[PDB]
Each structure stands twice: as structure tokens, then as C-alpha cells.
Amino acid sequence: GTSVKPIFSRDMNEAKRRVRELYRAWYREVPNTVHLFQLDISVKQGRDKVREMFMKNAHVTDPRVVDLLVIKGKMELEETINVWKQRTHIMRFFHETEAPRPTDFLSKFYVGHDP
Amino acid sequence: TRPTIRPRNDVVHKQLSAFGQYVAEILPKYVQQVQVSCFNELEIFIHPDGVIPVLTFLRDHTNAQFKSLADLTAVDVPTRQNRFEIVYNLLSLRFNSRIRVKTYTDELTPIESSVTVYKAANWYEREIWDMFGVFFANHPDLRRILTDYGFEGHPFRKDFPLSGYVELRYDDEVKRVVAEPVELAQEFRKFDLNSPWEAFPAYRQPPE
Amino acid sequence: QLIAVDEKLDITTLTGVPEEHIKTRKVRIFVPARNNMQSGVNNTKKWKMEFDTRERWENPLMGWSSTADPLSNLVLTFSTKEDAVAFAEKNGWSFDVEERKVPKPKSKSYGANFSWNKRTRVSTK
Amino acid sequence: PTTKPPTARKYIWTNHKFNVSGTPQQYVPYSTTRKKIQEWVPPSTPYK
Amino acid sequence: GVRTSPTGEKVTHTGQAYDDGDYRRVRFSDRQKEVNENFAIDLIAEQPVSEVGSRVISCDGGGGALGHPRVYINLDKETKTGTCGYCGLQFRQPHH
Amino acid sequence: LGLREIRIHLCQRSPGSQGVRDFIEKRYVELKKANPDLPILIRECSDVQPKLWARYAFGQEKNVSLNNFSADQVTRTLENVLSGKA
Amino acid sequence: GAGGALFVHRDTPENNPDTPFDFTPENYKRIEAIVKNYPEGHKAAAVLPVLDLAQRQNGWLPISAMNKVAEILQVPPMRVYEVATFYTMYNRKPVGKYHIQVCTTTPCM
Amino acid sequence: SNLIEVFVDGQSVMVEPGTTVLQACEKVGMQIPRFCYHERLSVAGNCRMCLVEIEKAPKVVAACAMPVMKGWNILTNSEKSKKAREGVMEFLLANHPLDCPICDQGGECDLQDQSMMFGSDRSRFLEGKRAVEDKNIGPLVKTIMTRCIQCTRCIRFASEIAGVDDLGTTGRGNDMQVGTYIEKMFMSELSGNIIDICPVGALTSKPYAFTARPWETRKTESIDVMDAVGSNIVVSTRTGEVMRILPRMHEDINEEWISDKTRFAYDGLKRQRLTQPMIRNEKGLLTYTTWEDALSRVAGMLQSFQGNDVAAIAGGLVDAEALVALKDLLNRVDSDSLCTEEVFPTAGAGTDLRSNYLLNTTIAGVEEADVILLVGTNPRFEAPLFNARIRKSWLHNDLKVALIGSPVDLTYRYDHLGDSPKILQDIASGNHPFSQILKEAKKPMVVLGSSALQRSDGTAILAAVSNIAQNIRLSSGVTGDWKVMNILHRIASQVAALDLGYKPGVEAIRKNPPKVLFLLGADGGCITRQDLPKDCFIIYQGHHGDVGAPMADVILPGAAYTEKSATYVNTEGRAQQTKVAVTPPGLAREDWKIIRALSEIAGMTLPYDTLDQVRSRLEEVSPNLVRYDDVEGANYFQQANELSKLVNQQLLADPLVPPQLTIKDFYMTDSISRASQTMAKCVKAVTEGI
Amino acid sequence: VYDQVEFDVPIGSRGDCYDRYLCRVEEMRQSLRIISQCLNKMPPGEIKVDDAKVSPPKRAEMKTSMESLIHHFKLYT
Ligand code: SF4
Ligand code: SF4
Ligand code: FES
Ligand code: FES
Ligand SMILES: [Mg+2]
Ligand SMILES: [Zn+2]
């Protein structure tokens, strides 16, 4: 029951199919992105980052949430392909000027009060 | 009551009440409520499934003729199970009138795009999607319109913080503009202004 | 057409909040206490959701109050505690709820000020 | 001002200064408040 | 009422001067420190106390609508003077 | 290696703690008479389950469920932990 | 017009808590007779007459007289201060041997 | 039943007989404007702001005093009611001074708000205003008498709640004034509350003067640690600094009041603060260092010693999280010498039964008793809100109070049975008339202060009081849930420590002098270096430089109660949690985080990494410590009485004398209050007249 | 008071840029007309609603009257 209306997919199988299609499109786009934006990363780095972004949301079990995630990923792909994005936008995925924040207890205790 | 109080208009109030009754009788499938505000502003609450029929009837009917869409926006009310309130404002030039149509949705439920009924909605629905995250089904070209490229989240939502989560600055080592977690030299100072004494008895709620 | 989704509601991956501000945060759901400097009770009608206080420091220039907490100002208003709990749950925030405290009904009696044999009699008026 | 002189006050500047930006006489902002938290001062004598 | 700290820095009306070990003094090297020289506490301390032949006096700071809100000062205590809470002027009844 | 403390978390009005309650009503007194130096902390429990806790040297602990135990079962378990067994 | 009399007390060498005041033995007999009229447990009701009695022996009411009445009746001193400052026949300052009071209300005016 | 039906604006409601019009309007959720009515004071009826129209009645009635009559129809928004409110506001504002920009009441003024909501927007007053001279009633309450609207709330509070008759009205009519008529200091442990109840800026806080406005403040709802009552408070902050402390209404505990130490000792949080870790240099002087160095030194000393050598003393302001963390850390080195500065008898049941060391009746219960016996304690200074509850019962329920101890002034009349502890035995045997008094009492209550327990004969005193309770129980039977036995605590950390298995008292330290000592906020001066061997390693953790700091080898700066989310258990056994208002200053850290980091450095890492995990461990040890605001407990008085009958320690001849003999002693008691300049001013004011 | 002034509304014929330019020029002329009327018809009186719970009072009233000061304070905070 729970009486919900879908966006595109009726169960997780169709949602997974759409996820795979979007992943294929991003995988094909990465080399062109590296060429056009004149990025100093490799194609391997770009595809690894695409996989990491996809795996960030691997725990989702709602087909509607997956449909919205695919819609957002398609929005980002359309944005990248048309060059609406600049090199700064593409490089924002890699956080190159962010100092690594530690995760163990002792370093956090040393730096400050935040957990 | 004369010099400083806004005058009333009962004729327009009666006309709008009668027309609201008219609209409700013609479309019982979707119309849930009809209201006439004290300053003569007709409001019609409907079911989401009736977004396209209602508007179509309102813009096409001989006695309606609301051929112009002033604006279309959304309101976020987190306490409601259906978070978002979709508000259409329509103007009739033939009858020199205005009408407001309201419906509801939540985060995961699409609303039918009304680009077919009104061409003006295109950018309005894109803006609602960008600011609030409300998806519109069958929209020609749905994408962000106001926010920056790659911006995460929807700013107009009540939960979103006023200054957001990231800022921008130019970094010389990478020779480009970078986005970093927001740090503020001076924090925005939250004021508590609400008076502990009630202002308007006419709006008092039952004590539950 | 309806698809009968079976799972609990969860929208964290769509809100765009950085994960640090989803997992390490604690919200408080409460009806705010009446300000003891006044007698009005109109600010004790609705439920509030607010986040935990984070570090504030002193700006080296001008000595202003600096923060790095983006949720340090966010306050949400709800009709009932159930709505607040549902919002916090669907947004993925750990919460602490406090039951609403109401003043107990008190038996007032002006004439008690002038009791024949009781301790309640006023020594002044 | 020759026919309508301004009112005289003893705190009004007797010598006008121009825009002193980009000059060793420029304004430099600073906090005008005093220290908020005082720290404990350990005793100067040995404890044993 | 200006006066310098042991470091040679002027002390403001507020009383704040950077401490000897405070690095922030570096912001004044090759520049100056802005200090207003007309101390209000000293200037108001020079005004003569006004003698009035009534128990309650009124003050509006002078200038009518150009001063402060008008207030009424009781002058029954003879051990002290009535001080305006806006302007700082002092009033007393003719005593002794 | 040895006992340092005992903790008995019993729930005030749940049926599954009833027998444990009887123990404290009758058999706790003489058990404290026999063990004047052993801290037997009697504490109140939330709707989950009754429990007994034993602490050993260098902070080693493990617990035993007392759900639906009768008073004799409770004192048998307590003498088992109090003796060089289990 | 305005009253003129102050309703605060400031100690003076002639009017302080150590100003000598005490009832005469005859006045103590009268105080006992006054106290008896009221119901037991309601002894304060004698604040109004006994205070007056003090003024009838001393001429006026020094702060020590108010303290003595408060201690005799076991009433908090601030209650006696309230009574003394409320009623206009109580003299909290010395008066002349003869107190001339001329009426100036409308029928008399 | 006995309910009568009345109508508020044509709407039916059922009310109890004798209910005032104001309360009936409140039943439907309408608030009648007021200035002089306070639901915790006696009705006055003087302000006249509450006047309302009753249908078919020509005269408006005062809603705060008039009892509703059956079939009445209140009309709270009629023209008559509105015009009454407008006229009364006009008369109130006629003589009021134009002081809002300089008044501390500015954004929090009931007069301002009700003028905006119910009054007119204009003045037609064309005369001069009255002005009155200021009164000086001490260093805590600033007085600006011109602002007074003559509500008389201060007079009713002082007379009825505080128990003092210093305030009053002198003169009459327009010239009537509120004051003391003489130079007197209104000094009492509940005095500051007259600032809260005064609706105008006539009575304001002197320490708080001019510092902040209400709209800029951030409100953090928290708990007080200045005593064992656990009063609910609001900490108001602005830009990372604590502005002031306000009461928060809790019906069960402190109502809407707080003691003066709870209200005015917060400035001590800004003085003598430990901000950085410190170690002893080569010359034996304390010098700043990093966290890593200090933790490494402490961990080295911890690794070498174990068992009986390692010991810890907990102070008065420690929280349950830090206590359990320290307990686990010392257990990992096989140490059980974890003690408190406050002594509780360990004989018989001891800490074994929660009922034995708690105020079983509770604060709320005092309202249901008719006889109370207090032994060796001063309720007024050890627990001012508890004494306020006792006076409330004494005033409204004719509660009879008797005391065994020095004849301290409790602000209400009681029966002084004496100060000899042997009298307790005389009551227990039955030769005293008070034995008969307790025999016939339906809800007898016996309260023993923890302060009395500090002396050497305390185990005997507890046995005698338990004997009195047992005699009452066997003679009258058990009525049900009454719990005659009660223990009154004065230290915030004591009940949680006892709940955690900590051994009360410092006796085990003297029995087994340790080599490594952990002073966890312990500033009582109980254990000095004369009571310890040489080369003893003393580690102090806390937020203030006090008795315990300058005698230590390593100093670890901790967080005060305003800078952490920590759990405290009051005298009732109720568990409450504080919230972070501001972060700890400098390099100071959360106490349990200090202990956990130290455990990691020494190799025996504690299982918990977050606050929820440490509270899960807290639940594992004592489950009642995570049930915030729950006070239900099981009575085990019979078992504890049996276990107490074993030993027969002899009673001392020394008369029962409390530590807080007089008001001056009340102010400076703990490290936060000892660092407060406001408390120093209060002490100077109560010792020196001026 | 737009119902009390007289002006014409320019109307185009072709819907192009040229027609929109002519409309704006004529609109400028009609605004001159309306301004002329407004100049000749300005009445006397106060400038804000005589309701101090909405509009701030005058400064002289704010410095003389208690209600005016209270309303100034509350309206500006
Ligand atoms: S008490 Fe209220 S009305 Fe009076 S001056 Fe202060 S803020 Fe203004
Ligand atoms: S000082 Fe405050 S509480 Fe006391 S009478 Fe005046 S207004 Fe009322
Ligand atoms: S006696 Fe003079 S007016 Fe009455
Ligand atoms: S509130 Fe009723 S007269 Fe004051
Ligand atoms: Mg006040
Ligand atoms: Zn002035």
C-alpha cells in the first residue's frame, strides 16, 4: 500500500535500468570532458570520480528517490556537455584546496570542540 | 472608521462569491474549497490531479476567459505532510478579474506541467523546481534557472540555511575559483521579535 | 497508477546537505519556555526544532563573533510534536523531544486574604 | 559661512583634515572592548 | 583624559589598549591608532550643577525637539544631586 | 580474576521482573549480610528486560538475563556468579 | 497643593533607632486594656490606638516609637511604618505645643 | 458533577466552583491583560487592567478576582472591555517616565506590549509628571522607582514567598510609594525574583544593567548546578557570551523561581578560568603546554601504577558522563578508589539501595504532607527552592514543621525540639511528645540533611532517623506511596556518583594513600599533600583555579556546566541534562572527552566515542540516568532498616550545627561562586551595613 | 488616485519594435500630462496614516508623549 505515485519507475528494476543508462552516458562523456575543459586529470580519474559519485547513493531503496537522483544526474550531464559549466565547476568535485579533515577521535580532540 | 480604515466593496465580494460557487459546481471532481478574502480576492483550492483540467476550463470557458497567467510560485510549509503549496495567479481581461488557484504536493510527487495550457509557466515551473525541488511532469526543458551550475539543494526551502553551505573565492595555487565550506567573519544575528501578547483575536486558534 | 512503495521515507540524498551536517547533528524538538520577564503566553503555542550549538570565536579584526556552523540560526515551527518528529526523521537528523510543560490549574480566592484563623491572611494590601 | 557662521563648540575640529587614505595617518580598525575571560594565574612559589 | 600605556599606546575612553604580548599591535606599525581625544566622561564632569527651587525638575537636553525625550528628576535626596539619565546634567535644590 | 561489584537491573512493574522483585523482597537482606563488602547495586529498569551484571578485575563485564526468573532461579544465578564457577 | 512631607525616613541625631522612647507604666496598663478588646490571635488590630497612644505621650512619633510599637505588638516594623505614613493625624515630625488646624474645604471656605 | 457551565464569548465551558473569570477565559485559550495578578501570588485587584464585561451586567468586573457565576457570559472583546483597557492604560501611562531607550525592560516590558496591544496610540495628558526618589535595597536589585506602576507584586512576593516583611507602601493616593521607608537591604536567597515579577523597569538586575537587549539574546534551556535541587533555567547568550540566567517554569521542581546564587554567580564563569593544559617545569612551576604532552605524562604515570595506587576524587560540579568515564578508566587499571568529597554512610545497605540516599517524598510531595521533621540541616541555604516549597505548604496547607539542630531562621515558624542528637533517640523510643505527634499524622515526613551526615557520628544519626521512620511505619502501617524517609542533598554531583557505584567520602584515600591522584573538579580541600605520600602524582581536571589547582602536577582544562550537554541528578533522583550555551574557552575540552583521549593514549581505549555512546554506557551501569524527568522509584526502606540495625555506632555529644549558619555563608560555597565578584559584593553587603 | 487623472493609453498596430518605441514616447507625453494634473491638484494634510501602531509618530511627539515613545520603540525594534 502506502499509496504513492511514481515519477518514472514502478519498481527498483526499472530504476536500476535508468541508473545503468545514465552511468553509460557519463562514462562515454568523461574523455570528451577532459579534452574540452583542458583538465589536468586523467580519464581514469574522471571515471573513478563518476563511480564514486554514483556509489555515494548506493543505499537508496526508494524508486522515486532513485528517479529523482537520475533526473539530477541527467541535468548535470546535460550541463557538462553543453559547456554551461566551466572548469571551476568540474574541478569542484575533487576539492583540491580543501585540507583533509581527520576522522579519528584523537585528532578531532586536538583540533577543537566539534565531533 | 472613516479616515484611516480601508473601505469595503460588497458588490465585488458578492460577484466573486457567486463565481466561486459557479466554478465549484462545474468541476466537483477537483475543487476542494472556495474562499473569498476580505479584500475581494477569490481563491480556489483543488486536488493536484485537476491542475490541467481546472486551468484549461478557467482559460477557455466563455464565462471565465482567464487567458493570462500573472505568475506561478510555491510556498513551503514544513509542518504539513504535503510540504509545498503551488499557487497560480490568473487574470481575465474580458471580465477584468483575478483568480487564485492553489494545490499541494510533497518532495517526491510530481505535478503536471501546464506549459500546454499557458506558455508563460515554462520558466515559472523551472524556477519552482530550482528553488523548492518540485518536479513537473512532461516539462519541455526542466533544469535550474536561478542557481549556480552544480549547486546542490534548494534555497527557498525552510530547512535550507540563509547563507547556504559553500562560498566561493579565487585560489592562486590552482589558479581558479573554488568552492569551500562557509565560514563567516560575523555570524548573522538571529533576533526574537515575536511579542508574547496576542495581537489579533479574530484569528485565535482553539486551545486544542 | 500506484506502485506500493514499502520503505520508510528518506530524502537526505536529495536535500544537498553535506553529510557532516546530517550525521553529527542533534536537533531539539520542544515548546519554548515562557520568558519569565513577561506574562504573555503567545510565544508558547507552537513547537520548535533547533540545532545544537557549535563553536563561536572572536574575529581577529574588530573582534566580531565568527562561526563556521551553517545551521546556527535555523529554527523550524510546527503545529504538533508529531509533525516535528516526522520532519526530523525524513531529513535524517537525530532528535531529542521534550514533552510540553503547561502551568497547572491553581485555586485562587480573594477572600482567603482575610482568613479568620488561616495563615493565608495578608499582613498588608 | 562668512555671513552665517556655524555654531561654536569646543569639541569641533579647529583644523580640517582631508582624505588620509593611503597614508601613515590612515584609519586602522580595531576592537574597542576589553578582555572577556580572565585566566587563572598559577602561584609563583613551588608546591613542594 | 587621554593617557598612554606602558607600551606608549594611547588608551581610549573605553580603556582598551593592546597588551605587551599581543601581536595585534602589528596592525598599527607604519600607521596610527585612531583615538578620539574628547573624553565625554570628563567633559560632562566639568558642567556646573544647576540649582533650582523645586522638588521636581525637567530636562530635555536643550533645543526642544533637538534634544532628548523630556524626563522629570526628583530632588528630595540632599546627600546627592539629581542626574539626568539622558544628558548627564546635574540638578539640586538650594541646600545649606 | 575476582568479583568487584554486582548490578541487578530489575523493572518496577513488569511481569517478567516479578520473581526478581520477590528476591529483593526476601532474599536480598541475608545476601547482603553474607557479603558486607560487595557492592550489589540494585537499579530500576526500562521496558526492555531484567538483567544481572558482574564486574571483574581490570574492568571485565558480562551480563545475564533474568527475564521470567523465579526467586530461586535468581538466587541460584547469584550464587553461581558469587562462586568460582561459570 | 502637594503634600510637602517626605515618605522616606533618613536618620538624624534627634531621630534614629537609638532615640530614647519607652511607654510609661500607666501607658503599659492602657496598652493592655487596648489589646484585650480585640479577639485573640488578632493583636495587630491594636496598631492604630497604641501608636496614637505613643504620640499622646511623646508629642510626635520618632522612628524608635514605631519600632517599640512593632516590638510590643509583634508586628513587622514595616507594617507600623505603613500605618504611620498612611494616616494624617500621626506626627512623624515634632510639632508645636498647640497644633492649629483650619478647615479650608468648600463648605468651610 | 460540581462543574458549572459558563460562556466565554458565547462558547460553553465547564469550570470548578470558585474559578475566577480570568481562569475561565484562560480555559478557552484567551489571555486577559493584567499587571497586578500573578497566579503564584495572592490576588490584589489593584491595577484594574483585567476589567471585562459580563453580558446583561452594567458594571465591568475584575476578572482576576471575581469568581464565575453559573450561566455567565464573559465578553472579552466587547466595546466596553476595550474602552476599559484603553482608559486604564491611559491612567497607567499618565505619570510614567519617557525612559524606554535607557530602561533595561525595553524590549521585555509588559507595559510596553500591553500599550501596543490594548491601549491607545496617543497621549492627551498635558500636565507635568510625578518623580520619586530612588531606593537602595542592596547590590543585586537596581531600583528606579519613578517607573513603578504600583502593582504591589514585589510586596506580595516578599511577604508570601520569601517570608520577609521589608517591602511596603508609604503615603497614600498619588504620592503612595513602594519601598522600605528606611535604609534597609532586602537581602534574601530568593530576592532576585522580584526582578522577574516586576512588570516594569522599576526593579532591574544590577549586574545585568545596560549590557544587552532581549531581541538579540539566544535562549538555551538548561539546568542549574549551584545546589542539588536541579532548577530549570534559561541561559541567555549573545555572540558567544553568557548574558544572564533566568528561571524556566518547572511545576515539580522550582516553579518559576531560582535562588540568588543560581541567578547571579554566572559572572564567576569569566574569572579564574583554566584555559590551557599545564605541567610543572624544572623549577616546580606550572607552565602552559600542549594537550599531547600533558596527556602523555598522565598516561605514563597511569601505566606504571595500578590497583590501589590509583585514586580519584570527584568534586561538586561533575557530570555523570565524566564520572562514568573516570570510573571505567580507573577500573581498567584495577582501581576501585573512586570517591567523592561528600560523605554518606556505607554501613548496611549504603549506596546499595537507591531509596536509602534519596529524597523519596520529592519536592512536589511536600505539598501533600502535614508534619515534617528536619534534622541537622538548614533547608533555607542548602536548598532554597525546597525551603520555598516548605513555606508554601506551611502557608497554604497548615503544615507543621519541627527542627532538630541550631535554631536557624527558616522564614516560617517551626517547633525547635533542640540540637542534641540524643533527642532523635528520645523520639525513636517514644518518650517525646513529638512521637505522639508523628504517630497520628496521615502524611508524616522526616528529612535528614546530607550536611549532618558529614560528621563522624553520621552513620548513627542515619540509623536513629531510620528508626523513627520505622516506628511510624509499623504504628500507622503503609498508606501506599508515601515514603516517609528522605535525604536532603546539597551537592549536584552526589546522587549520580552514588548511582554509579562511587564510594562516598574520602576515607579510602586516607586508608590507602595513592601514588596517582585524579582530582576531578575536587576543590573541597579535603585531601592535601600532608595526607599523601611524597612524589604523589596529582592530576587536576576542572574549569576554575581554586584549592585543587595549585597543588597539582598536571592541569587539564575542562568545561563548566554552561559549556556542555551533561547529565545531573538532583536530590529527588530525577535525571536532567544541560545544553551547550557557549563552547569552552581557549583549549578547554569536554570532561569525558578528556578522559577518553587519555584512555586512548594509555592503551586502554574506552568503548565509547560519542556522547550517545557514553550515555548508552551510562544506561548500562545505572539505567535511571537516561530517563530524563522521571522520578518514579521503588521503596526499599524495610531492607535498609534491617541492614542498618546491624551496627550500633555511638552518637556524639556535639550539637547539630549546619555549615551555613547565616546568610553571609550562603553566597560563596563552590568554585564558580567563589570566583564571582557579585557574590563578593553580596558578602560585603551582608557583613557591612553601609 | 489614478481614477482622478486624465490620460490616453497609446496603442500599437503591428506588434513590432517600431510600434513599441512609439508607444513609449507617447507614454512619456501622457506622464507629463498626469504630472501637470498632479501638480495642480495636490491637497493639504498629513503624509502618513494617522495610526501610530502602523506609522511612526513625529519626533516632537516621540520626545514629549509616553505613548508616542512606546510606539516609536516598538515600531523600530
Ligand atoms: S518600564 Fe517599559 S514602558 Fe517604562 S520606560 Fe521601561 S520599557 Fe518603557
Ligand atoms: S517595583 Fe515593580 S513589582 Fe514592585 S510595586 Fe512597583 S511595579 Fe510592582
Ligand atoms: S468643617 Fe469645614 S468644610 Fe466641613
Ligand atoms: S489583574 Fe485584575 S486588577 Fe490587576
Ligand atoms: Mg522588572
Ligand atoms: Zn538631560
Cell of G36: 484585650
Check: CB of residue H221 under 8 Å from CB of residue C34. Answer: no
Half-sphere exposure of G32 (CA within 13 A, CB side): 5
**Ligand 6 mean position, distance from CA H206 (Å):** 22
Run of H or E residues at H538: strand H537-542
Q: Experimental method used, please?
A: cryo-EM
**Greatest distance between any 2 Cα atoms in chain A:** 51
DSSP secondary structure string for all residues of H308-366: GGEEEEE-TT--HHHHHHHHHHHHHTT--EEEESS----STTGGGBGGGGS-SS-TTGG
CB-based contact B193 I51, cutoff 8 Å: no
> How many Å apart are CA H505 and CA H454, to the nearest integer?
9
Q: Using H for helix, E for strand and C for coil, what is the string for H367-431?
A: HHCCEEEEECCCHHHHCHHHHHHHHHHHHHCCCEEEEECCCCCCCCCCEEEECCCHHHHHHHHCC
Q: Exposure of H592 by Cβ count < 10 A (0-12 exposed, 13-18 middle, 19+ buried)? A: buried
CB-based contact A109 H610, cutoff 8 Å: no
Amino acid code (one letter) for H459: T
**Which residues, in sequence order, are bridge partners of residue H339?**
H313, H503
DSSP secondary structure string for all residues of B38-92: TTS-EEEEE-GGGHHHHHHHHHH-TTT---EEEEEEEEE-TTSSS-EEEEEEEEE
Q: Exposure of A40 by Cβ count < 10 A (0-12 exposed, 13-18 middle, 19+ buried)? A: exposed
> How many Å apart are CA H431 and CA H423, to the nearest integer?
10
Check: CB of residue G54 under 8 Å from CB of residue G68. Answer: yes
Query: Which residues, in sequence order, are CB contacts of E86 under 8 Å at separation 6+?
Result: E59, E61, E68, E69, E71, H101, H102
Check: CB of residue H399 under 8 Å from CB of residue H442. Answer: no
Whose CA is closest to atom 3 on ligand 3?
G108
Whether chain H has a CB inside 8 Å of the CB on A55: the answer is no
Sole residue written with cell 547469584? F78
Q: How far is CA H14 from CA B23, G64, H9, H20, H521, in A?
A: 43, 55, 14, 13, 55
> How many Å apart are CA C95 and CA H441, to the nearest integer?
47
Cell of H626: 537516561
By C-alpha distance, the chain H residue nearest C103 is: H251
**Where are the alpha helices (H) located in chain G, listed in sequence order?**
25-37, 47-58, 63-73, 77-86
Radius of gyration of chain I (CA): 22
- Residue G38 is classified by DSSP as S
N- to C-terminal Cα distance for chain C? 74
Q: Is there an interface between D and B (3+ Cβ pairs < 8 A)?
A: no
Run of H or E residues at H243: strand H242-247
CB-based contact I49 B4, cutoff 8 Å: yes
Q: Which domains does chain C have, with CATH numbers?
A: 19-113 (3.30.160.190)
At B167 the three-state DSSP class reads strand
At E94 the three-state DSSP class reads coil
Amino acid code (one letter) for C42: N
Q: How far is CA I5 from the centre of its chain?
A: 13
Angle at H358 between CA H650 and CA F41, to 5 degrees: 90
Check: CB of residue H515 under 8 Å from CB of residue H535. Answer: yes
> How many Å apart are CA B77 and CA E44, to the nearest integer?
55
> How many Å apart are CA H84 and CA H333, to the nearest integer?
75
- In this complex, the residue of A7, A79, A88 whose CB is nearest that of residue B176 is A88
Run of H or E residues at B98: strand B97-105
Half-sphere exposure of F28 (CA within 13 A, CB side): 27
Q: Is H337 left (phi over 0), alpha (psi -120 to 50) or beta?
A: beta
Q: How far is CA E92 from CA C52, E42, E76, G9, I33, in A?
A: 54, 20, 9, 19, 65
**Ligand 6 mean position, distance from CA E81 (Å):** 13
Closest Cα in chain H, distance from residue A105 (Å):
7
Whether chain B has a CB inside 8 Å of the CB on H212: the answer is no
CB-based contact H597 A105, cutoff 8 Å: yes
> How many Å apart are CA H382 and CA H572, to the nearest integer?
14
Q: Choose among H250, H223, H478: nearest CA to H362.
A: H250
Angle at H238 between CA H233 and CA H242, to 5 degrees: 45
- Who lines ligand 1 at CB under 6 A? H 96, 99-100, 103, 105-106, 109, 111-112, 147, 200-201; I 70
Q: Exposure of I39 by Cβ count < 10 A (0-12 exposed, 13-18 middle, 19+ buried)? A: exposed
**Ligand 4 mean position, distance from CA H34 (Å):** 5
Cell of C90: 525524513
Whose CA is closest to atom 4 on ligand 2?
H154
What residues does each domain of chain A span?
Answer: 1-115
Q: Is H155 left (phi over 0), alpha (psi -120 to 50) or beta?
A: alpha
> How many Å apart are CA H511 and CA H453, to the nearest integer?
20
**Ligand 2 mean position, distance from CA H156 (Å):** 10
Query: Which residues, in sequence order, are CB contacts of F36 under 8 Å at separation 6+?
Result: none
Q: How far is CA C113 from the centre of its chain?
A: 38
Cell of H129: 509628571
H103 lines ligand 4 (CB under 6 A): no
Q: Is H322 left (phi over 0), alpha (psi -120 to 50) or beta?
A: alpha
> How many Å apart are CA H593 and CA B51, to the nearest integer?
56
- Inter-axis angle of helices G77-86 and G47-58, nearest 10: 70
Closest Cα in chain D, distance from residue E14 (Å):
7
DSSP secondary structure string for all residues of G51-81: HHHHHHHHSS--HHHHHHHHHHHT--HHHHH
Check: CB of residue B187 under 8 Å from CB of residue C43. Answer: no
By C-alpha distance, the chain I residue nearest B195 is: I74
In terms of residue numbers, what domain contains F4?
Answer: 1-86
Q: Which atom of ligand 4 is nearest to the CA of H43?
A: 2
Cell of H631: 522520578
- Share in percent of chain E as helix, strand, coil (round to 5): 15, 20, 65
Amino acid code (one letter) for G91: N
**Greatest distance between any 2 Cα atoms in chain E:** 58
Check: CB of residue H98 under 8 Å from CB of residue E70. Answer: yes
Q: Using H for helix, E for strand and C for coil, what is the string for H170-217?
A: ECCHHHCEEECCCCCCCCCCCCCHHHHHCCCCCEEECCCCCCCCHHHC
What does DSSP say about strands F40-45 and F5-11: parallel, antiparallel, or unpaired?
Answer: parallel
Q: Strand (E) positions, chain F? A: 5-11, 40-45, 51-55, 61-65
Other Cβ atoms closer than 10 A to H550: 16
Amino acid code (one letter) for B66: F
Q: Choose among I26, I75, I35: nearest CA to I51.
A: I75
Could you say which ligand is closest to the alpha carbon of residue H34?
4
CATH of G25-86, one of 3.30.1330.40, 1.10.1740.10, 1.10.10.1590, 1.10.3720.10: 1.10.10.1590
Sole residue written with cell 516594623? G77
Other Cβ atoms closer than 10 A to G96: 7
Whether chain E has a CB inside 8 Å of the CB on D31: the answer is yes
Q: What is the CATH number of the domain that holds E63?
A: 2.60.260.40
- In this complex, the residue of F4, F42, F58 whose CB is nearest that of residue H354 is F42
Q: Tell me whether residue G108 is annotated as binding.
A: yes
Q: Exposure of B81 by Cβ count < 10 A (0-12 exposed, 13-18 middle, 19+ buried)? A: exposed
Angle at E50 between CA E47 and CA E52, to 5 degrees: 175
Check: CB of residue H254 under 8 Å from CB of residue H386. Answer: no
> How many Å apart are CA F37 and CA H387, to the nearest integer?
37
> How many Å apart are CA H417 and CA C24, to the nearest integer?
58
Cell of H293: 604532552
Whether chain G has a CB inside 8 Å of the CB on E55: the answer is yes
DSSP secondary structure string for all residues of C7-58: SPP--HHHH---THHHHS-EEEEEPPPPPTT----TTSSSEEEEEPP--EEE
Sole residue written with cell 515630625? G93
Q: Choose among H571, H657, H654: nearest CA to H376.
A: H657
Run of H or E residues at E57: strand E56-59
Burial H382-416 (b: 16+ CB within 10 A, else e): bbbbbbbbbbbbbbeeebbbbbbbeebebbbebee
Number of separate helices (H) and strands (E) present in chain B: 3, 9
- How many separate domains does chain F show? 1
Whether chain I has a CB inside 8 Å of the CB on E68: the answer is yes
Contacts of G2 in chain E (CB under 8 A): 55
Q: Counting one residue from C and one from G, how many pairs have CB atoms under 8 Å apart?
A: 8
Check: CB of residue H191 under 8 Å from CB of residue H527. Answer: no
**Ligand 6 mean position, distance from CA H299 (Å):** 65
Known binding residues of E for Zn(2+): 59, 68, 84, 87
CB-based contact C123 G76, cutoff 8 Å: yes
**Ligand 2 mean position, distance from CA H29 (Å):** 27
Query: Which residues, in sequence order, are CB contacts of A107 under 8 Å at separation 6+?
Result: none
Query: Which of H38, H42, H49, H156 gets mutated to test ligand 4 (max ligand atoms within 8 A of its CB)?
Result: H49
Closest Cα in chain B, distance from residue H215 (Å):
5
Handedness of CA F43, F46, F52, F55 (dihedral sign): negative
**Where are the alpha helices (H) located in H504-650, listed in sequence order?**
507-511, 591-601, 611-621, 637-644
- Chain G interface, best mutation among E76, E80, E93, by max G CB count within 10 A: E76
Half-sphere exposure of I41 (CA within 13 A, CB side): 11
Q: How far is CA B29 from CA B112, D11, H128, in A?
A: 17, 78, 70
Q: How far is CA B28 from CA A72, B34, B113, G87, in A?
A: 37, 11, 22, 79
